[PDB]
């Protein structure tokens, strides 16, 4: 509980959060493709504190030793600081409320003239403070069930824990240096492989990432193999049933269902509207994907409640939810004050389903390491926009979309650190203090960082440097969302309801049979991840499982303790390169070559 | 001497030679890019004879065991049969004598109307028989000096010998199965890597072979890294001084000399004529390349003669040269009968320099595994065309170009098998019998195979399927060659003479210093190989030396006996795939995808 919270750690976390906020914010306001930087934060937290201790030792100043528990605290505090930068919708949703996006959207029903709000320090900071801490309190009951009871493996959380453990190991065990040397060989190889790939991804859909390994026809169906060691490494430490389910979901959606649905491009949905829109082939993608997750997610949530209810019938869990209710009512009486377009009971509905929605995202992140939190926000934005008419509907959808996205996204990304703390033997009490401190600085720094960018430069211009494409894209969903569920394509609800029931049946089927049949049951929400992303992620995960399957047969003993080290090195090596790659995009240094693939034209 | 020459081996070699002639001839008359198929012949010779013995055992017929010595005989006899198909200039030079190429070349000085000859069984077979056996007799004195005295490593000969040895090993030694399993792991990996590469080389200069590893600017200077395991594997078993010399030659020519010469595209040589022509930047490439080889080649040839002359002064070698003189005078009194355009003393000059020219090619092939025999023919074609005026000059250049090319190319490719026989403990006496028998069938089958293609189809049409581009290209060199050395670009002879002297000085310098300085002297004709081919071959060879250098430091003991096995597997794996790739081109099955690289346009 103590010896892990230090003043130097607070300074280090504050600095790491500040630069990582600037990197995230600048990328968000220029391209909207914010990268994952959690792994890089662990390395920077390690280097900064070891450098400070050595520099003081050089000057003769003695300092307390820097252990792995303190490294986890600094990394966790730093991550929470810059997570608010993109979880708060500064480049997607909150920027969609400005006047510039209102004019670009044009004149249409729902887009009434009173649907713009201007950014400011006073209201952005208060908006974040009220709602950011809501997700933190939900984590405490979720930490027990997911991290250790359900034994969910968080591949990025597990990889970071091994990386942090390898930094602070000092005693010469016989298996330790076999692991450390194995980690270092593949860490350098993966980092150099990612560095080599960068020079050839200099165009739209070209490079080693867009490699048509099984042909150009299968590549267009997203059934290729990108040379991503993050997904290959993640699949190595995931169970085979998770990897098989991921591929099985990609086959059903991209190999069968989407081609069959696309044959009705003129009947079921209009063909003039572009794809990736909620009226054309993306309503199928978004609603079927959540229905698979929600159908599986609800049953486990009811099962936990049902088990808990029976246990107390037979006879700090309520402390966290009491604080959550206190923060819930605080947002209920504050958010409508800032936005008169948002009614009081809109916030109430958002805060009741958030523990239930946050659980599903955390469970899904604990299976496939994919955070779908921003996908929940898109559905909630569409639904909440339909709960209001043309008047006060666009702002209501955007504001309520930020609420659902934050409590869902924050919960899943911050379960990554609890898995890291579990493996590094860090006290959960000290973790939550770093959770609150990191979130508190994030709710202060990010509004300040955004407005410095906002005042100095011009963000939102379609023809310019600081272009925020997702500010207008998120605005259009709310404009499309003011109309009810009628705008969804034909049979969209019927198919979604069928997949909701099908997901529930698998959850029923898995838990009712004996274990010697129950391990062949595919996981419904591991299936749902490739419904939105392509099947390349599924192929990469299965390749990682194939490597472990072959390795175990060849050498059972070595694969027992070397698979986690090799898999973590592959994840960390690609994760570390994400930091220099972001700096290159920060300085506008584009790749020189574009590796295109053509049909022998 | 016996137990290696068998009737079943003769039948197997005759069959393997016949199909390989058809594959070579069809590719020669359609694209002119004849591939290397020596490695594949060893595998097919092994499978055919093992299949025959097992099939007879299944039917109850008992047969003599099939040893590795018999496998070397069959492979050597088969190789000599189909080597004549492309060494005889059936698709480049002999096809340039037909009337179709004469009309396509147009009306120009030197291209007199009496400069066409039509193909036929009677004269093609007699032309080959007179001159093909000339190179065989020169091999006997060359076998002693090059294979074992000079200890030249023939990477394709060494790789084939290890492949043949691994086929016929039966006793469970402790290091044998470590070598066999190491060979098989990299043989399958290299073969599958070559198979994977094929689907993406579906265009002009696109694919993994044309990979700009160091940028597009360096790729245009041929300073990239093609993913060729043949050159990487060849460089592994070559000494470091050979690999370093190869890179050092590529730096001088492509990195320095060619860019400097190209700055005078309007002054030194005319700019209207295209490159790769003897009047524009290719006279520099061709004449400087030979001058480096000839300067080094002459000194070693004089050194052997000087050493031999001193030895006999102090006091079967002459049997081979007595037979060579007998075959030399036979061609002198026969070739001018077929071609009245060729004078008797043209053949005499060709047959005197052929042992001296053949030695240099065999020495160069024993260093870098690159056969430059067809490059000698281009120089001899140009020179002999200049020895005659506009009258009887084009045919004289073409016919004399075939003579010089055959005795030079045959000598170098057939020293590959003598290195194979040396490592497989095959009797040299039985090797020469397979040399003569294989050449005798080659001089019969190839004229017959060519005319069956010639009579049935239409070869030589620029707009058609059976197009022979090199038939017209070789015709144009003779047309350009009737004019003397004045057509060469400015300072072409001066620079060539400077490199001839510079090559000689290194040969002087290497043999005069003590050995503890003599190992740093670059080899002049290992430098000359990247003067015509790009520097990618140099980079691949140096990467192979880097792998061996790192492997030796990490584990001295294992790298001692596993480097030849791994290197041979890389060469054999790419060599084996050359057979199915040729069948795909035989059936006109083109690669589906073309992996292009663009400057981020
Ligand atoms: C033993 C293991 C390592 C096997 C290797 C994987 C194969 C199963 C893959 C690798 C390359 C793949 C091929 C790569 C490219 C194509 C081109 C594709 O043709 C196209 O449609 C390209 C575009 C066009 O031609 O219009 C058809 C599938 C095919 C043959 C793929 C079939 C499956 C292949 C052979
Ligand atoms: C074992 C691990 C490492 C993954 C290997 C998977 C591939 C070898 C196979 C398995 C699933 C196959 C896919 C299954 C389904 C389809 C759907 C099919 O889609 C269509 O029918 C086209 C629809 C249209 O016309 O739009 C094309 C082949 C493809 C992509 C197949 C291509 C090859 C895949 C990716
Ligand atoms: C530790 C080892 C493995 C180092 C890895 C090799 C590097 C030394 C190579 C690999 C990629 C190479 C780069 C690949 C591509 C380019 C693009 C090239 O720019 C171009 O001219 C492309 C065409 C254009 O932009 O017009 C400049 C060199 C550079 C940076 C190359 C510089 C050298 C690099 C970094
Ligand atoms: C260590 C082994 C594995 C090989 C690694 C070699 C590369 C790292 C280096 C060594 C030689 C270098 C080349 C040396 C000379 C040149 C010549 C230079 O040519 C020009 O000046 C351009 C002339 C023009 O404008 O036409 C461009 C850089 C280049 C290709 C360099 C690119 C990078 C190379 C290939
Ligand atoms: O939101 C989006 O769809 C895109 C890409 C998806 N986001 C990028 C990484 C995190 C993810 C997310 O949001 O969780 N981001 C728009 C700008 C910014 O990321 C934001 O959301 O404000
Ligand atoms: O000769 C050439 O320049 C080209 C490519 C080079 N030849 C192909 C492989 C062997 C090499 C050689 O000839 O030794 N071949 C033209 C047709 C045929 O190969 C022939 O030469 O009759
Ligand atoms: Fe986003
Ligand atoms: Fe040729």
Structure description:
2 copies of one chain form a homodimer. Chain A is mostly helical and 601 residues long. Chain A has one domain. Chain A contains 23 helices and 1 strand. In chain A, helix 10 packs antiparallel against helix 22, helix 11 packs across helix 14 and helix 15 packs across helix 18. Chains A and B meet through strand 1 of A and strand 1 of B. Bound molecules: cholesterol hemisuccinate (4 copies), the ligand O=C(O)[C@H](CCN1CCC[C@H]1C(=O)O)NCC[C@H](O)C(=O)O (2 copies) and fe (iii) ion (FE) (2 copies). One copy of the ligand O=C(O)[C@H](CCN1CCC[C@H]1C(=O)O)NCC[C@H](O)C(=O)O binds next to helix 15 of chain A. The PDB classes it as metal transport.
What is the gyration radius of chain A calculated from CA atoms?
A: 24 Å
Distance between the termini of chain A: 65 Å
Q: Which protein chains make the most extensive interface, counting residues with beta carbons within 8 Å of the other chain's beta carbons?
A: A-B, 18 and 18 residues
Instruction: Quickly give the structural class of chain A.
Output: mainly alpha
Strand content of chain A: under 5%
Main sheet properties of chain A? none
Helix content of chain A: 55-70%
What is bound: which ligands? cholesterol hemisuccinate, ligand 5ZS, fe (iii) ion
Tell me the number of helical segments of chain A per DSSP (H or I, 4 or more residues long).
23
* Oligomer designation: homodimer
The shape of chain A, in one word, is globular
Can you count the beta strands of chain A? Answer: 1
Order of helices and strands of chain A: HHHHHHHHHHHHHHHHHHHHHHHE
How many structural domains does the protein architecture of chain A include? 1
């Amino acid at each position: 509980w103590q010896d892990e919270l230090t003043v130097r750690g607070l300074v280090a976390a504050l600095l790491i959060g500040f630069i990582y906020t600037v990197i995230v914010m600048k990328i968000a306001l220029t391209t909207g493709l914010v990268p994952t930087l959690n792994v890089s934060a662990a390395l920077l937290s390690f280097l900064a504190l070891r450098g400070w201790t050595r520099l003081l030792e050089r000057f003769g100043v003695v300092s307390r030793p820097f252990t792995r528990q303190e490294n986890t605290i600094v990394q966790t505090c730093g991550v929470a600081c810059y997570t608010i930068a993109f979880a708060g919708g500064f480049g997607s949703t909150l920027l969609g409320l400005n006047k510039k996006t209102y004019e670009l959207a044009g004149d249409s029903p729902g887009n009434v003239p009173g649907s713009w709000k201007e950014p400011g320090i006073g209201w952005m900071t208060g908006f974040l403070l009220a709602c950011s801490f809501g997700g933190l309190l939900t984590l405490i009951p979720l930490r027990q069930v997911l991290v250790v009871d359900y034994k969910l493996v968080y591949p990025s959380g597990t990889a970071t824990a091994i990386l942090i453990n390898g930094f602070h190991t000092d005693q010469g065990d016989k298996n330790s240096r076999k692991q450390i040397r194995g980690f270092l060989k593949y860490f350098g190889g993966s980092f150099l492989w990612s560095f080599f790939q960068w020079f050839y991804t200099g165009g739209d859909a070209c490079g080693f990432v867009q490699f048509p390994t099984f042909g150009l026809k299968a590549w267009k169906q997203t059934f290729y193999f990108d040379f991503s060691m993050t997904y290959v490494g993640a699949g190595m430490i995931c169970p085979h049933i998770v990897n098989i389910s991921t591929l099985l979901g990609a086959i059903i959606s991209w190999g069968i269902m989407w081609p069959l649905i696309s044959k009705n491009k003129g009947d079921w949905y209009p063909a003039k509207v572009p794809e990736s829109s909620m009226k054309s082939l993306y309503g199928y993608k978004a609603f079927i994907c959540i229905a698979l997750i929600m159908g599986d997610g609800m049953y486990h949530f009811i099962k936990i409640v049902g088990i808990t209810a029976m246990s107390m019938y037979r006879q700090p869990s309520w402390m966290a939810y009491a604080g959550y209710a206190l923060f819930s009512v605080l947002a209920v009486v504050t958010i409508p004050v800032m936005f008169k377009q948002v009614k009081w009971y809109y916030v109430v509905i958002a805060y009741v389903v958030a523990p239930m929605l946050g659980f599903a995202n955390s469970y899904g992140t604990g299976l496939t390491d994919i955070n779908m939190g921003y996908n929940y926000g898109k559905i909630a934005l569409f639904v909440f926009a339909g709960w209001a008419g043309k008047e006060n509907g666009v702002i209501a959808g955007l504001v309520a979309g930020t609420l659902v996205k934050q409590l869902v996204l924050i919960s899943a990304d911050l379960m990554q650190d609890f898995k890291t703390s579990y493996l590094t033997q860090t006290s959960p009490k000290s973790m939550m203090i770093a959770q609150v401190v990191g979130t508190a600085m994030g709710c202060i720094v990010s509004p300040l960082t955004f407005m410095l960018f906002y005042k100095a430069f011009d963000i939102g211009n379609p023809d310019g440097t600081w272009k925020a494409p997702y500010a207008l894209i998120y605005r259009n969903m709310a404009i499309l969302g003011v109309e009810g569920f009628s705008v969804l394509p034909k049979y969209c609800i019927v198919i979604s309801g069928g997949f909701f029931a099908f997901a529930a049946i698998l959850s029923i089927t898995r838990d009712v049979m004996p274990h010697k049949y129950a391990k062949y049951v595919p996981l419904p929400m591991a299936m749902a991840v490739p419904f939105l992303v392509g099947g390349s992620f599924a192929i990469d995960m299965c390749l990682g499982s194939l490597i472990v399957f072959a390795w175990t047969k060849i050498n059972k003993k070595e694969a027992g303790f070397m698979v986690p080290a090799v898999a973590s090195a592959l994840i960390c090596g690609d994760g570390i390169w994400t930091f220099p790659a972001s700096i290159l995009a920060l300085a506008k240094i584009k790749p020189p070559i574009c590796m295109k693939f053509l049909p022998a034209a």
